[PDB]
Amino acid sequence: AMGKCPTKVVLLRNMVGAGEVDEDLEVETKEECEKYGKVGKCVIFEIPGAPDDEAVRIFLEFERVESAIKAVVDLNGRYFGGRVVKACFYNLDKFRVLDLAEQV
């Protein structure tokens, strides 16, 4: 179960629905997550044909794995815009090659 294994990469799901990634989503996400530690990179990818509570995936690569662990514990189950956010980890090497649709 990839999502359960701590890494520098945090995956946020259910932030917004399919086709709903507005112009402010990335900055709203990034600037909140910097409170857990320095964020190195943010990728938003929408999985074609996926369900609405799963299509939009937001990846944050932290500089420290310690910051990433803080993020997951705080962000999992947290509200964002009326939705319950799912937060977990993602494999670093898959993230670095943009293999972004793996089951977590």
Binding site: E28, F80, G81, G82
Partner: peptide
């Protein structure tokens, strides 16, 4: 600095 969507309930 409109308030973020963080912690917004339904």
């Amino acid at each position: 600095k409109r308030k973020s969507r963080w912690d917004e309930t339904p």
